[PDB]
Amino acid sequence: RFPLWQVITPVRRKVILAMALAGLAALTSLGALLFLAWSLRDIRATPDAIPAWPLGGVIGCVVLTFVLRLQAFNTSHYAAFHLENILRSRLARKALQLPPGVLQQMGSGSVAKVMLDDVKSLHIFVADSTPLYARAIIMPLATIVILFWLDWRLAIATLGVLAFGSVVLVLARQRSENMAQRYHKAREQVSAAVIEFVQAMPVVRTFDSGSTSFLRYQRALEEWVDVLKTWYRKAGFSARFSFSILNPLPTLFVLIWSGYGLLHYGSFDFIAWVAVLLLGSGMAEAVMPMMMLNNLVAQTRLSIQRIYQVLAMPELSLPQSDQQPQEASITFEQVSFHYPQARTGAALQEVSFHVPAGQIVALVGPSGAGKSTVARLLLRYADPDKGHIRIGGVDLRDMQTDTLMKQLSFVFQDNFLFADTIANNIRLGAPDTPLEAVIAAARVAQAHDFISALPEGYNTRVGERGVFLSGGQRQRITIARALLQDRPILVLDEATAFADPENEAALIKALAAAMRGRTVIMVAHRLSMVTQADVILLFSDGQLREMGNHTQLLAQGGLYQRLWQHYQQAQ
Amino acid sequence: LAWRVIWRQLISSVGSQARMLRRSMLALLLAAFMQGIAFACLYPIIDALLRGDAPQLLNWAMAFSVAAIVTLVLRWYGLGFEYRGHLAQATHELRLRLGEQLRRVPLEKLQRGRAGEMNALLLGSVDENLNYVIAIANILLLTIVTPLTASLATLWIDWRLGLVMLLIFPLLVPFYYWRRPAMRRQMQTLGEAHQRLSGDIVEFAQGMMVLRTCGSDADKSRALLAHFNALENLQTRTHRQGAGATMLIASVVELGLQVVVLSGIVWVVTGTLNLAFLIAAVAMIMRFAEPMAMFISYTSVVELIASALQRIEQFMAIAPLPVAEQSEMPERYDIRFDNVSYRYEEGDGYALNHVSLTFPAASMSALVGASGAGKTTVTKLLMRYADPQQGQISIGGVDIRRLTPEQLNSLISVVFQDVWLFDDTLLANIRIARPQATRQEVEEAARAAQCLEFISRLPQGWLTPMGEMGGQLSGGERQRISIARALLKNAPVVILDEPTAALDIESELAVQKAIDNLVHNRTVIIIAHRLSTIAGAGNILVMEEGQVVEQGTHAQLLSHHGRYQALWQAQMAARVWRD
Ligand SMILES: [Mg+2]
Ligand SMILES: [Mg+2]
């Protein structure tokens, strides 16, 4: 499908301009060598006169040759930079538009590999080979005609040299087939192993004492080095032959022996031989710079194939009707969902429940029940296998991404911070938000007290995952970030974990004073939160087993009675 | 700066393949010299022509042929470093050395960085360091050594022609010295930009769930695109800045090689230089002008290699926490703090101020307090996360600084608050704590953590793959897997930091059963905001603003009105949402 030809499409005009100027520089170099050969011939015929006109021709052609070469290289470099920017922006947009499950499965290390290293590999090709490709396709084609017009026997000899080189190179082609998948998988596994090693260092140092450094990192390194050795061995012969057949020495050797043979046959012409020697660099020495980068171009080809494979992933079936919600009420209608991993049973079997607006719905159940699953399905993490999820009567499938996400402020079970600034983290998605609103949102939570205590206050820096901040403090920051949005439905996934009971009670009372008419979805294992709520939904083994108030589920005497009794006996 | 430092850095980076690299570069240098000699063989060959002296024409053609053969075989053998696995072996060894350094650098300073930034060093900086060494050596030896040898032999043929041919090599030195700072700055700036971009991309990938919620088209992704555009502008500006310099260098070189031919022509028409020698010199110059013009541009790759070496050595220059007065294994396991006061980097908190406490062996102690009190700080400093500026921490009668990190990590088994699973199977995730364990032991550890139930409900069983951060499992399931991992390791001291944050009441009681079983023969430290689980602790330590404000047991602490009593009342207090 010509991936190399495909990638240069956004910068096609500049790439073709670079090709044209490289070809013009090549032709001008041939003209320079012709003028210089004419100067030598004139000196041979007249050993007492300066060939002033041919010498002016050769010097002018040299000047134009290097000017055009440098300008073409500059154009190629600008095109390469523009192409890198375009490819990186498109990859980022695709990652944004990719389904959350697909992107999570593919991995952060894979994203770093494809977005950074694969796009970086495009520079070699675009900015340092297309002028060389143009030179290697222009100089031989004109040079063969010039030498045939000049001396057809030396032309045949040098053309035979070039043909031998080209035939050997074509015969020895690895084609990079049946090993590109292994090469990639090794590359992204090494990247993911490095990221995992860095971000899980306390766990590695505590538990992984068997191997120096990190065991999975070592395994990935060995797989990558095996792949690299195989790739280098497979490409060694072609690279090293192209480096020895396109050297000036083989061509000079063949030309010299042909000239000796012609002298022995009594048909040697000195001027024609000299002009062939001067002009013989265009056939086989023109392909030499391209073959110096052929291997990196093959690596760029593999990276390009990976990039276009990433961009060829299905998206989450965006609609075009653009219907809007008008009720802020949630509805699950016989929804069943299976994760991409073929887990037995199902995450949800026949979940169906209606939450009218303004309701403090609290989600309870044992671990693995599927509370985070229904929260993610509300967040359009994936699409239900059966049933429908609706917000305000209109289906989530019949919504734009912006339309759906303007409805829900979500607090994730895992508290993630984008490093940066605490104030910046809270005001994420809106840098123009004044610090007054950020402080108000933090006051709705209990973050403001410890934030003021910190010396830099709101501008205090936090780690990559928020490591510079306490777990409870990090969760409070995420809560404040969600509250700053003021979106109609607020979903919480264990928002009061990692927090002492005093902070938990303060957060509950403040948030109750705050989300007055807002529909609040609650996931909590601490049943003291759910003892006073508008409705309680209990999940077990992926099934919505019970639904009702605390008194209703307590009187029903089902799965909720045992949980509440154990919780109350504990405290 | 100094090329000797660059050479020793390159030798260290290559490592065990240093002798192979030196031999390959010697082969490349000999190939360049022999190619220059082969070009020098033209002077008699062209002189053989125009005259028809076939005998010595063949005599010198054989010399040219053998010179070309030696040059070809020498280049073929010297380029084998890239294709015979030596480059791959050197890269593997450098990656292994850099990975081990990650295992030894202080954890506090390491957490001050970013995972993406470290990914660009262990993965990208290495390939910038090693993947172009042989190629750039071959290009620079061809660019300089071969024309130098050709001009030196021309000096033998004609001292006037040889001198003017040689006069260009001193001319390149001022241009190289003038352009070297610009190339150095450009390479350093591109390296820093690439590292920052790698970190930003990794963070952007790791927070797509949060990013999708905020919406408003792109806001943080808007910053990512701004970074992309800034990188484009940086590269374009750097290329434009050096475009005029490159044009000037190319013009000067190619026209200083265009006056050598003019001087030779003047000498020939004057009758003092042979026409065939002129043709040979012209052929050499035309085959040498193009590589020589961009020698300075070729040195940019050398600058890049130097920058990668500098970054790698800066990372490798980080020193571990000192191990002073190395000691043996402590025979008791009673952790004691003595006047410990620890200040975090870039932090004015002075958290864990003047903290003195005791963790009795064969007992279970609990740490309670508000969020940010410093309990996780206690757990981290017990693992030698950072050295205390004041006070001493002792596992037994031996201070931690008297132990190496391996011994301390052998004596400590920790359930972390930030639950981290590895991107492999569940069986290996549990087994990494103690791989030399029977499968029955692993099953017992899983049962103690009450996690076999959902393992049975896994179609892949124990071979179920765990994603990054253990994404494929729930929070409670992942946390119980971490508990089982810690349980499998047999360490004298077990530190659990909020072991049951994401567990239901039944799973939490089941886990607390095994936690209480651990008490009899292991030192146990437990951090919990769920005060019901840790009411049975032998000792409970109350923390506030980095100080241990109050000490006692459950009954003793509840008898006297204090912070523990207030926390228990808050836990027992009803929560009202008012519809
Ligand atoms: Mg969950
Ligand atoms: Mg903590």
Author numbering:
A (entry chain A): 13 to 583
B (entry chain B): 10 to 588
The paper states:
Initially discovered in Yersinia enterocolitica, Ybt is a virulence-associated siderophore molecule synthesized in many pathogens such as UPEC. The metal-chelated Ybt is then imported back into the bacteria through the outer membrane importer FyuA and inner membrane ABC importer YbtPQ. In YbtPQ, TMD1 is formed by four TMs from YbtP (TM1~3, TM6) and 2 TMs from YbtQ (TM4, TM5), while TMD2 is formed by four TMs from YbtQ (TM1~3, TM6) and 2 TMs from YbtP (TM4, TM5), a typical swap of helices (subunit intertwining) in type IV ABC exporters.
In this study, we successfully trapped YbtPQ in the occluded state using ADP-Vi in the lipid nanodisc environment. We then determined the structure of the occluded YbtPQ to the 3.1 Å resolution using cryo-electron microscopy single particle reconstruction. The results show that the translocation pathway in YbtPQ is completely closed on both ends, and the diameter of the central cavity around the substrate-binding pocket is ~6 Å. Thus, this map represents the occluded conformation of YbtPQ, which is a high-energy intermediate state after ATP binding. The periplasmic gate is closed by strong hydrogen bonding among three residues from TM6 as follows: YbtQ-R296, YbtP-E297, and the backbone of YbtP-L289. However, there are considerable conformational changes in at least five transmembrane helices (TMs) and two loops of the TMDs. In the meantime, the cytosolic gate of the pathway is closed by three groups of residues through strong interactions. The NBDs in the occluded state containing sharp experimental densities for the two ADP-Vi molecules are further dimerized compared with those in the inward-open state. In specific, adenines from the two ADPs are oriented by the aromatic YbtQ-Y353 and YbtP-Y351 from the A-loops through strong π-π interactions. Here, the orthovanadate molecules, which mimic the hydrolyzed phosphate groups, are specifically stabilized in the binding sites by residues YbtQ-Q426/YbtP-Q425 from Q-loops, YbtQ-H538/YbtP-H537 from H-loops, and YbtQ-E507/YbtP-E506, as well as the backbones of YbtP-F510/YbtQ-L512 from D-loops.
